[PDB]
């Protein structure tokens, strides 16, 4: 109908619904399962915990790492997790049984970041050892070691068909890699060169969102090599804080912050539309539910909790 219209944009109204207690040290990452049913958390306490995505109810603890965990990530079918640990390994877990399927050995220092590719036949990892590794999920063996950076690797992420990996480092660089060959296709340069603390592809793989330790998030068109948007106002000078695209309602950028708040920006206008108060330490990780307007946030060791926030839009 000619009267069909685009709705007037409405600011979100995320409100605290649940606080998820159980970790005994800083939480390091939270991620919603692709099927929307579960939230996984990792912690410096060496544990992974699974919680109901909608009701926040504790489901199970997954144990096995010998030291703290920095990151955890889901396979596309929501059946597997991979975790990255200070014990220098990654582990692949069967979520239903809680059992460790494979231990991925090869990094020579702390593993800081990890992700499955969309096909979920590969895992990519990044380490304090300055390398990015690509692993075969089935065999649990390392396929490629990329001499990716000259300082610790803060983030690694596949694009939507797994043909590219983006990595970031404290060396100040973002790099795009051809998954199949391991060859570097592009390097992003900042002449001021602040450490890059996080990077990920946009949900359509057209852009990359990168955090630098000067309180700044940037949306880059990596094919044109130009910055489209900048998001500021939060505090990020020390930690590798995740950022997200929220796409279930209004299109937002979401990030934790060193002032204990969750920041939500309008993706287009770059204005802060909400700040979520409640955590009592640095919000190191946030995640956005794949279908409902729900955010998970996780905080460092003065807090140790995960919070679930829900919005009407
Ligand atoms: C379903 C969506 O909104 C997304 C897709 N695909 C999306 C969101 C934000 C950006 Cl910048 C790109 C793409």
Swiss-Prot record:
One family name in Pfam for this protein: Beta-prop_WDR5
Effect of residue 112 to L: Strongly reduced affinity for histone H3
GO cellular component: ATAC complex; histone acetyltransferase complex; histone methyltransferase complex; mitotic spindle; MLL1 complex; MLL1/2 complex; MLL3/4 complex; NSL complex
Quaternary organization: Interacts with PAXBP1; the interaction is direct and links a WDR5-containing histone methyltransferase complex to PAX7 and PAX3. Interacts with HCFC1. Component of the ATAC complex, a complex with histone acetyltransferase activity on histones H3 and H4. Component of the SET1 complex, at least composed of the catalytic subunit (SETD1A or SETD1B), WDR5, WDR82, RBBP5, ASH2L/ASH2, CXXC1/CFP1, HCFC1 and DPY30. Core component of several methyltransferase-containing complexes including MLL1/MLL, MLL2/3 (also named ASCOM complex) and MLL4/WBP7.
Record function comment: Contributes to histone modification. May position the N-terminus of histone H3 for efficient trimethylation at 'Lys-4'. As part of the MLL1/MLL complex it is involved in methylation and dimethylation at 'Lys-4' of histone H3. H3 'Lys-4' methylation represents a specific tag for epigenetic transcriptional activation. As part of the NSL complex it may be involved in acetylation of nucleosomal histone H4 on several lysine residues. May regulate osteoblasts differentiation.
Glycyl lysine isopeptide (Lys-Gly) (interchain with G-Cter in SUMO2), cross-linked positions: 6, 25
Record has Nucleus as a keyword: yes
Site (Important for interaction with histone H3): 86, 112, 242, 301
Subcellular location: Nucleus
Bilayer-crossing regions: none
Reported impact of residue 300 to A: Abolishes histone H3 binding
Keyword presence, Cytoplasm: no
GO molecular function: histone binding; histone H3K4 methyltransferase activity; histone H3K4me1 reader activity; histone H3Q5ser reader activity
Family: Belongs to the WD repeat WDR5/wds family.
Keywords: Acetylation, Chromatin regulator, Host-virus interaction, Isopeptide bond, Nucleus, Repeat, Transcription, Transcription regulation, Ubl conjugation, WD repeat
N6-acetyllysine modifications at: 91
Each WD repeat, start to end: 22-61, 64-105, 107-147, 148-187, 191-232, 235-275, 278-312
Encoding gene per record: WDR5
UniProt cross-references to PANTHER family, sorted A to Z: WD REPEAT-CONTAINING PROTEIN 5, WD40 REPEAT PROTEIN
UniProt protein name: WD repeat-containing protein 5
Biological process annotations from GO: gluconeogenesis; negative regulation of transcription by RNA polymerase II; positive regulation of DNA-templated transcription; positive regulation of gluconeogenesis; regulation of cell cycle; regulation of cell division; regulation of DNA-templated transcription; regulation of embryonic development
Outcome of swapping residue 242 to A: Strongly reduced affinity for histone H3. Significant decrease in interaction with KMT2A
CDD domains per record: WD40
InterPro entries: G-protein_beta_WD-40_rep, WD40/YVTN_repeat-like_dom_sf, WD40_repeat_CS, WD40_repeat_dom_sf, WD40_rpt
């Amino acid at each position: 109908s000619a009267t069909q219209s685009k709705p007037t944009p409405v600011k979100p109204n995320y409100a605290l619904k649940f606080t998820l207690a159980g970790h005994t040290k800083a939480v390091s990452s939270v991620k919603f399962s692709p099927n929307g049913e579960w939230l996984a958390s990792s912690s410096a306490d060496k544990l992974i915990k699974i919680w109901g995505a909608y009701d926040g109810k504790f489901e199970k603890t997954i144990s096995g790492h010998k030291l703290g965990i920095s990151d955890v990530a889901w396979s596309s079918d929501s059946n597997l997790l991979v975790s990255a640990s200070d014990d220098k390994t990654l582990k692949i877990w069967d979520v239903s049984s809680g059992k460790c399927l494979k231990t991925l050995k090869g990094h020579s220092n702390y593993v800081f970041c990890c992700n499955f590719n969309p096909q979920s036949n590969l895992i990519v990892s990044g380490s304090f050892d300055e390398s990015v590794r690509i692993w075969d999920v089935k065999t649990g063996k390392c396929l490629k070691t990329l001499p990716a950076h000259s300082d610790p690797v803060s983030a690694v992420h596949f694009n939507r068909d797994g043909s590219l990996i983006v990595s970031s480092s404290y060396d100040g660089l973002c790099r795009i890699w051809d998954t199949a060959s391991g060859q570097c296709l592009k390097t992003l340069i900042d002449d001021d060169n602040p450490p890059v603390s996080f990077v990920k592809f946009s949900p359509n793989g057209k852009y990359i969102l990168a955090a630098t330790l000067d309180n700044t998030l940037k949306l880059w068109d990596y094919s044109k090599g130009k910055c489209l948007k900048t998001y500021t106002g939060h505090k990020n000078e020390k930690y590798c804080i995740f950022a997200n695209f929220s796409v279930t309602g209004g299109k937002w950028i979401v990030s934790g912050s060193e002032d204990n708040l969750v920041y939500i920006w309008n993706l287009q206008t770059k204005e802060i539309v909400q700040k979520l108060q409640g955590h009592t330490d640095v919000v190191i990780s946030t995640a956005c539910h794949p279908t409902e307007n729900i955010i998970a946030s996780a905080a460092l060791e003065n807090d140790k909790t995960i919070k679930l926030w829900k919005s009407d839009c």
